[PDB]
């Protein structure tokens, strides 16, 4: 079996040119797709902004149209999902995680148009969901579609072009090449057995889709936060404590996200109308709140910079947090099309900032700046609910660009995964596949 | 399927023993690495001090430069030949093997031999890195506490071996992420599933980085400052640079391997023709670390200087050739010490040179040679050792120009792509393949 290894070693890192070239086309498409999707969601949130100006007098009438637009679009989104592709509701990352294990179908002819226009609906109405959901899945199907359309054969070409689509999907959603790649090879890939995912192909995919994203989204970062201060070595223990706090809260969040999936199922019982209606009702509540308290609504990217700069009061923070846990659950849990990845960054920021506030007053000898705790805490909910620290860290890092905060970021992150383990929480992406895969067996 | 649901619900669960044991491994590897770092420093400084004492008489100084380097080199090659041949050269492939259960981790031997062996080769100013020594030293440390604590299981044997190897790279570059990424991209059993707990590898690296920071805070290994940016119409240039690294990547692998052989003849396996040729190159090192220090040493010194575009074109080409020669002669000659470091320094110098050409050719792009320096810096590591994702994140963590992420990836990828289509192989694997096949044949 050593002789086998010698033969393998000498044959390492060889990816059929077909695969490579096909990853390239994959990335390019996912990029354009995500670009288009992003522009779509923007256009719609702008339309809705335009109607609130046409009715800018009459207060209740404005509160009406805010609700009704959000209603109408959310419904339209929930519909498309229920009526044409149930798999494309909720996130869509576990759906892809499954596909990689060969345990789920990649019904692209369905999902692509449903998840796309479906999300365009839910995100475009200002619901509390990210774009990673839609684009990761959309990304995977694009990878499937071009595997089909080109009839490429083999386990490699089916795992690889599915994974590179998935990555280009995260990369194009955050402008975060490395985060895309790291996500695949830390969370996405078949977690329990060896697989034939060519990493070099994953790359080319992501490269393309980042280039695509940069062509149309040049010269504006999603989160601008500026160069923050440093953290002295005697400051480190404080990030570990923050990590612990995230570590206990991590699974508690997972309970509610799952539990809420259930408690909302009853409200509609699986009924296409009780759903779409409940769908547009949460949706309406979103457009409403995206006016009377916009920090409680929307994707969350907008208040990240604001909180990091320490511009919110303590009151205002605790409010934003509570209001955002509620609205985050209500949208994701209710099986609307859209990731929980983005609003998890937003919650981790707000929570980390709050810790930093308290940290600042209690330790003036440290010369603290709340905003370093905001950035540490930013990817830490992602590290105790999704349990992909390495992805969270390198995502935050790629986005906030405070590499000097590498230690506090790791230490917070690690402390979060450690306490999220010792309090018996479960990789929220896994647990959703386990519920979905089990729900398929236990109805036989 | 049923099995998978059982697995999913049981994912990311690491026996607390393993975690706690990782923490201690990192801590030791950190301290070890620190101490090793200080050692090499100390000895380069001794030699600096003797050249002060004989600073008059020109050929007398050129001699003492030679003879200290000679004597230390010898002491290194000896300790290696006489007590642990496994700990000559890099020691990364040696650990890669151990991960595959195909090599032994004779720590009782390697620890003292690689340590003091390296202290000899590095401390005499040889063209070798610290990653070699620290990575291996790191794995054995992980082995040793697996032994000393009698931890049982495949997990505990692969995990504590890996976290040690990571902590080892991390503390060698102050690069936590590069440590972990290296494990799960290059070090791990490349062809079968394994039981390396990533959460455990983290904790290791955390500890060893904290260890490194405690003694080496407020000094970056490479300072380069915030470089300029790269416009989109400039990207193609990094792809061309990547292709150039892609062709030369394997060509370098040839000579590094070929030279391991052409130098074996000179000694035939004989502990005396070895140790003597050992201190002969070693002497030529300290000698050159005086009459042209850029051609000698670890190479970190000239990175900043090249990135700022302070070398002329002549001076660069020279430094390149000189450094290819000296790099081979030191690593190829099976002296204890990585080729990782000198590969960065080669990549910078090559990249810079490309950037110079680039600048004069395209004034409308407003280029700055130093952006090609930083692209190229991890590009040789992407075409010779073929671990681009570790290369990028390593350079990124060390040069901190996140804005150059695209050029860095594009160059890197273009290098792994052309080092595949010209039939080169992961230089760390090819060394294991040589070593495992020379075992059975």
């Amino acid at each position, epitope marked *: 079996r050593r002789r086998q290894l010698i033969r393998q070693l000498l044959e390492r890192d060889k990816t059929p040119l077909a695969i490579l070239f096909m990853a390239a086309v994959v990335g390019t498409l996912v990029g354009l797709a995500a670009v288009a999707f992003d522009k779509g969601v923007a256009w719609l949130q702008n339309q809705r902004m335009g109607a609130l100006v046409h009715t800018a007098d009459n207060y209740p009438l404005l509160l009406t149209v805010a609700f009704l637009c959000s209603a109408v679009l959310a419904m339209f989104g929930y519909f498309l999902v229920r009526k044409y592709a149930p798999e494309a509701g909720g996130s869509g990352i576990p759906e892809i995680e499954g596909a990689l294990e060969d345990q789920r179908p990649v019904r692209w002819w369905r999902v692509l148009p449903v998840k796309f226009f479906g999300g365009l609906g839910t995100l475009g109405g200002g619901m509390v969901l990210g774009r990673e959901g839609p684009t990761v899945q959309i990304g995977g199907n694009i990878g499937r579609m071009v595997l089909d359309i080109f009839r490429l054969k083999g386990d490699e070409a089916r795992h690889t072009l599915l994974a590179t689509g998935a990555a280009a999907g995260l990369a194009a959603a955050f402008n975060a090449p490395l985060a895309g790649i790291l996500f695949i090879i830390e969370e996405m890939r078949p977690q329990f057995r060896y697989t034939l995912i060519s990493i070099k192909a994953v790359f080319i995919g992501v490269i393309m889709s980042t280039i695509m994203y940069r062509i149309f989204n040049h010269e504006v970062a999603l989160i601008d936060v500026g160069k923050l201060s440093d953290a002295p070595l005697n400051t480190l223990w404080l990030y570990l404590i923050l990590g612990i706090i995230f570590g206990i809260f991590g699974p508690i969040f997972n309970k509610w996200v799952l539990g809420m999936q259930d408690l909302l199922h009853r409200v509609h019982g699986g009924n296409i109308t009780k759903w779409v209606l409940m769908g547009g009702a949460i949706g309406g509540l979103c457009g409403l709140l995206g006016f009377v308290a916009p920090a409680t609504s929307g994707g969350g990217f907008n208040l990240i910079p604001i909180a990091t700069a320490g511009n919110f009061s303590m009151g205002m923070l605790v409010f934003i947090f509570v209001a955002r846990v509620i609205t985050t659950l209500l949208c994701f849990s209710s099986g609307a099309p859209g990731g929980i990845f983005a609003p998890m960054l937003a919650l981790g920021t707000v929570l980390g900032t709050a810790f930093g506030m308290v940290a600042v007053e209690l330790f003036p000898q440290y010369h603290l700046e709340a905003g370093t705790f905001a950035i540490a805490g930013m990817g830490a909910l992602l590290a105790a609910s999704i349990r992909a620290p390495l992805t969270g860290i390198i995502l935050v890092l790629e986005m906030t660009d405070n590499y000097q905060l590498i230690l506090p970021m790791i230490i917070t992150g690690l402390g979060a995964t450690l306490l999220a383990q010792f309090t018996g929480g479960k990789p929220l992406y896994s647990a959703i596949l386990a519920r979905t895969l089990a729900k398929q067996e236990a109805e036989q | 399927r049923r099995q998978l649901i059982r697995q999913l619900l049981e994912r990311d669960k690491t026996p607390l023993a393993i975690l706690f044991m990782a923490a201690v491994v990192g801590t030791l590897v950190g301290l070890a690495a620190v101490a090793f770092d200080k050692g090499v420093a100390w000895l380069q400084n001794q030699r600096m001090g003797a050249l002060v004492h004989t600073a008059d008489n020109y050929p007398l100084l050129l001699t003492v430069a030679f003879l200290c380097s000679a004597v230390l080199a010898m002491f290194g090659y000896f300790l290696v030949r006489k007590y642990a041949p496994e700990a000559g050269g890099s020691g990364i492939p040696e650990i890669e093997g151990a991960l595959e259960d195909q090599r032994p981790v004779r720590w009782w031997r390697v620890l003292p031999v690689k340590f003091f062996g390296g202290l000899g080769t590095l401390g005499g100013g040889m063209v070798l890195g610290r990653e070699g020594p620290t990575v291996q030293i790191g794995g054995n440390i992980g082995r040793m506490v697996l032994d000393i604590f009698r931890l049982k299981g495949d997990e505990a044997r692969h995990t504590l071996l890996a976290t040690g190897a990571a902590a080892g790279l991390a503390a060698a570059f102050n690069a936590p992420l590069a440590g972990i990424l290296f494990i799960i991209e290059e070090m791990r059993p490349q062809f079968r599933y394994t039981l390396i707990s990533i959460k455990a590898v983290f904790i290791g690296v955390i500890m060893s980085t904290i260890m490194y920071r405690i003694f080496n805070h407020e000094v970056a290994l490479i300072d380069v400052g915030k470089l300029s940016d790269a*416009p989109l*119409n400039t990207l193609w240039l990094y792809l061309i640079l990547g292709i150039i690294f892609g062709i030369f990547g394997p060509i370098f692998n040839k000579w590094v391997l070929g030279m391991q052989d052409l130098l074996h003849r000179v000694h035939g396996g004989n502990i005396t023709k070895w140790v003597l040729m050992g201190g002969a190159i070693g002497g030529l090192c300290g000698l050159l670390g005086f009459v042209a220090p850029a051609t000698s040493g670890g190479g970190f010194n000239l990175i900043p200087i090249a990135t700022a575009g302070n070398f002329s074109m002549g001076m660069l080409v020279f430094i390149f050739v000189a450094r290819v020669i000296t790099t081979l002669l030191c690593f190829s000659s099976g002296a204890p010490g990585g080729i990782f470091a000198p590969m960065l320094a080669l990549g910078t110098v090559l990249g810079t040179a490309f950037g110079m050409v680039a600048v004069e050719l395209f*004034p*409308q792009y*407003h280029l*700055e040679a130093g952006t090609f320096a930083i692209a190229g810096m991890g590009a040789l590591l992407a075409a010779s050792i073929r671990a681009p994702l570790t290369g990028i994140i390593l350079v990124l963590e060390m040069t901190d120009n996140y804005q150059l992420i695209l050029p860095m990836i594009i160059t890197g990828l273009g290098a792994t792509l052309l080092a595949q289509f010209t039939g080169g192989k992961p230089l760390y694997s090819a060394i294991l393949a040589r070593t495992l096949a020379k075992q059975e044949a």
Partner: antibody
Amino acid sequence: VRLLESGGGLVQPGGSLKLSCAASGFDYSRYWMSWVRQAPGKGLKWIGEINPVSSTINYTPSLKDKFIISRDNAKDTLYLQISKVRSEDTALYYCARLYYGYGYWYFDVWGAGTTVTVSS
Amino acid sequence: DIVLTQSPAIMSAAPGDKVTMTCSASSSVSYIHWYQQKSGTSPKRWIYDTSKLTSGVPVRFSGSGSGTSYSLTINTMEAEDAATYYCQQWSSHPQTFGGGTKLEILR
């Protein structure tokens, strides 16, 4: 953001003057700067550009040190020095901050200009 | 160094009119920029990279072209558009400016 150039006015033919452009509202290093002049009634003429690290300075098809461009990142100030001033050099002089989109460079923000009159 | 020549040197339309001026260039140039210089004001970067609008430029303004001819168009020109407009390229060094097209208003 503002560029407020000065030191212009009256010079004797053949003689020489130094324009300062003083900038404030943006990290002045980070930015390639430039000078563009405009003769009364006529169009625009690029003079030169200096990067932040002063390690690249291109001028237009000029002469010897017909023009000399420099910058003091400490003072946030751009300088243009003209020699042997024949009357072609009677213009409004703009210091402009340089930038790009896809990567083809433009003149981002222009100062107000000082006037230089070559006359006896 | 590319010589850029601008269509009408002086043009004249009445508000409401769709208006076009032109930057024809001696060699091939790509991604040109346009500057608006109103009376006794400094140039203002107007349209950049052939067709992108600077922030705050009314959407009544547009850009197109490629190769040797480029244009700038105002769909329903407005009286506050009286300026001279220069085009400028920097696809080839050194960069170079147009002759200017002075738009004058009919009222």
